[PDB]
Enzyme design. Structure first.
Site, PDB file in Angstrom:
ATOM      1  N   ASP A 186     -24.387 -16.389 -20.862  1.00  0.00           N
ATOM      2  CA  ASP A 186     -23.041 -16.930 -20.561  1.00  0.00           C
ATOM      3  C   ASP A 186     -23.196 -18.428 -20.280  1.00  0.00           C
ATOM      4  O   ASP A 186     -24.036 -18.786 -19.438  1.00  0.00           O
ATOM      5  CB  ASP A 186     -22.383 -16.160 -19.416  1.00  0.00           C
ATOM      6  CG  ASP A 186     -20.917 -16.500 -19.233  1.00  0.00           C
ATOM      7  OD1 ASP A 186     -20.465 -17.482 -19.845  1.00  0.00           O
ATOM      8  OD2 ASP A 186     -20.238 -15.777 -18.478  1.00  0.00           O
ATOM      9  N   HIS A 202     -20.241 -15.371 -22.838  1.00  0.00           N
ATOM     10  CA  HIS A 202     -19.306 -15.052 -21.725  1.00  0.00           C
ATOM     11  C   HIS A 202     -18.518 -13.775 -22.032  1.00  0.00           C
ATOM     12  O   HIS A 202     -18.000 -13.674 -23.149  1.00  0.00           O
ATOM     13  CB  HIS A 202     -18.318 -16.217 -21.571  1.00  0.00           C
ATOM     14  CG  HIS A 202     -17.409 -16.131 -20.389  1.00  0.00           C
ATOM     15  ND1 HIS A 202     -17.864 -15.873 -19.121  1.00  0.00           N
ATOM     16  CD2 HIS A 202     -16.080 -16.330 -20.272  1.00  0.00           C
ATOM     17  CE1 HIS A 202     -16.854 -15.887 -18.285  1.00  0.00           C
ATOM     18  NE2 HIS A 202     -15.758 -16.164 -18.960  1.00  0.00           N
ATOM     19  N   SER A 242     -12.920 -12.508 -16.467  1.00  0.00           N
ATOM     20  CA  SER A 242     -13.165 -13.937 -16.598  1.00  0.00           C
ATOM     21  C   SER A 242     -12.947 -14.691 -15.271  1.00  0.00           C
ATOM     22  O   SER A 242     -13.659 -14.497 -14.346  1.00  0.00           O
ATOM     23  CB  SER A 242     -12.365 -14.537 -17.749  1.00  0.00           C
ATOM     24  OG  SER A 242     -12.960 -15.745 -18.196  1.00  0.00           O
TER      25      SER A 242
END
Length: 398
Positions: free
Chosen positions: A350, A378, A255
């Site tokens: 995403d 995502h 992330s």
């Protein structure tokens, strides 16, 4: 303009509704025990979310949200002490791990690094305490080292607290390869049990450090060069560790960590065999046009507030105005030098960070590697996880 397309101009139905977020996604995420409820149980979370729903609590940044969780964690910690009193170590670990997940969700999505008295910070401190006790009972325990930040300069802090986990038979005579995990916005050193299981299963050491502007990271969040100093200190310690082989090292950025994996792939290319950047941002994620709609997509709550603070900014306005010029790996020219082997992974659709921030990297420097997942949001979970270990085995191969 974006690859996300029609979904870009969409307000996702969970925006500003904790009820929809629970009933449509998180209830199922918690049920399945997957991100962000990994290591957790639904029996622990069902009553908390029913309470949050009844009281129409929707803002996760609020104390009313965080405090709704802490009674459950207290109850779990006492059940563990009970389990341990009867010499039941396995039940004691599992209850403390479940306690640690209640704290994790209570502090979602960000612990404000500028508010040490915040209830989310207390939640994070209780989490680390709960988790380390849980992982003390393991045959290969997670150990916390406080690494002196010898490369600290300027506003940098003094101490780099990292989690180390070593496989059975890791010795100064047979030093094992390392996988240095770099965590993200809402996931910190205690939120990676399964990754350390998989790393140890393949005979490698797991090292877990947080990124600039999160958790206990002493890196000046406002200084783009702070992570370079951060890793200089961490790798220098891992160089001095007898049983850890820094000549066979991969970094794995998840992330928000993805950014720091990509950067490390260039800045420390000579010290790494690879990097993995999972769901990463590097340039377009800081585009004012992207930032104008980022809060309307798949992130469970508002993210700009957290991003602002994480990039060392005082206001969201200042973050939106300046962040790209200052932090883009494209704009600063970080991407224009060669890099170690870099695996990029993400869902194509995403709406937290653009897929374009994976695709840009193919137009600079060394060849990059990638696997992108049609129609997925995502991080592209669950699809993107098994190929992570496939790749690691190849790179770290003997």
């Amino acid at each position: 303009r974006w690859i996300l397309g029609d979904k870009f101009d969409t307000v996702f139905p969970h925006k500003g509704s904790l009820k929809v977020l629970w009933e449509s996604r998180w209830k199922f995420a918690c049920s399945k025990s997957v991100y962000p409820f990994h290591d957790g149980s639904i029996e622990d979370f069902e009553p908390i979310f029913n309470h949050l729903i009844s009281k129409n609590i929707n803002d996760a940044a609020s104390d009313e949200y965080t405090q709704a969780f802490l009674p459950t964690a207290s109850a779990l910690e006492e059940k563990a002490a009970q389990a341990l009193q009867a010499g039941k170590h396995e039940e004691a670990s599992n209850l403390l791990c479940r306690a640690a997940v209640v704290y994790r969700i209570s502090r979602f999505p960000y612990v404000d690094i500028t508010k040490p008295n915040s209830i989310k910070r207390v939640a994070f401190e209780r989490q680390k305490q709960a988790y380390l006790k849980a992982t003390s009972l393991w045959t290969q325990p997670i150990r916390e080292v406080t690494v002196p930040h010898t490369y600290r300069t300027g506003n940098d802090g003094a101490h780099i607290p990292i989690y180390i986990r070593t496989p059975a038979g890791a010795d100064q005579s047979n030093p094992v390869p390392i996988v240095l995990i770099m965590t993200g916005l809402d996931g910190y050193r205690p939120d990676n049990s399964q990754r350390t299981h998989e790393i140890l299963a393949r005979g490698w050491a797991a090292v877990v450090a947080e990124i600039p502007g999160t958790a206990d990271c002493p890196a000046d969040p406002a200084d783009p060069a702070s992570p370079d100093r951060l890793w200089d200190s961490v790798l220098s310690y891992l160089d001095q560790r007898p049983e850890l082989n820094t000549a066979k090292m991969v970094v794995w950025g998840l992330s928000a960590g993805g950014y720091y994996a990509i950067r490390a792939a260039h800045t420390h290319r000579d010290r790494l065999l690879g990097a993995i950047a999972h769901g990463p941002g590097c340039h377009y994620y800081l585009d004012p046009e992207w930032l104008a709609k980022v809060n309307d997509h798949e992130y469970p709550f508002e993210i700009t507030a957290a991003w602002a603070t994480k990039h060392g900014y005082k206001t969201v306005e200042e973050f939106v105005a300046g962040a790209q010029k200052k932090f883009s790996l494209v704009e600063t020219g970080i991407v224009d030098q060669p890099s170690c082997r870099l695996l990029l992974l993400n869902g194509v659709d995403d709406g937290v960070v653009p897929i374009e921030d994976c695709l840009v990297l193919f137009e600079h420097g060394s060849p990059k590697e990638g696997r992108f997942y049609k129609g997925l949001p995502h991080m592209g979970y669950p699809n993107s996880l098994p190929v992570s270990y496939e790749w690691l085995e190849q790179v770290l191969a003997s």
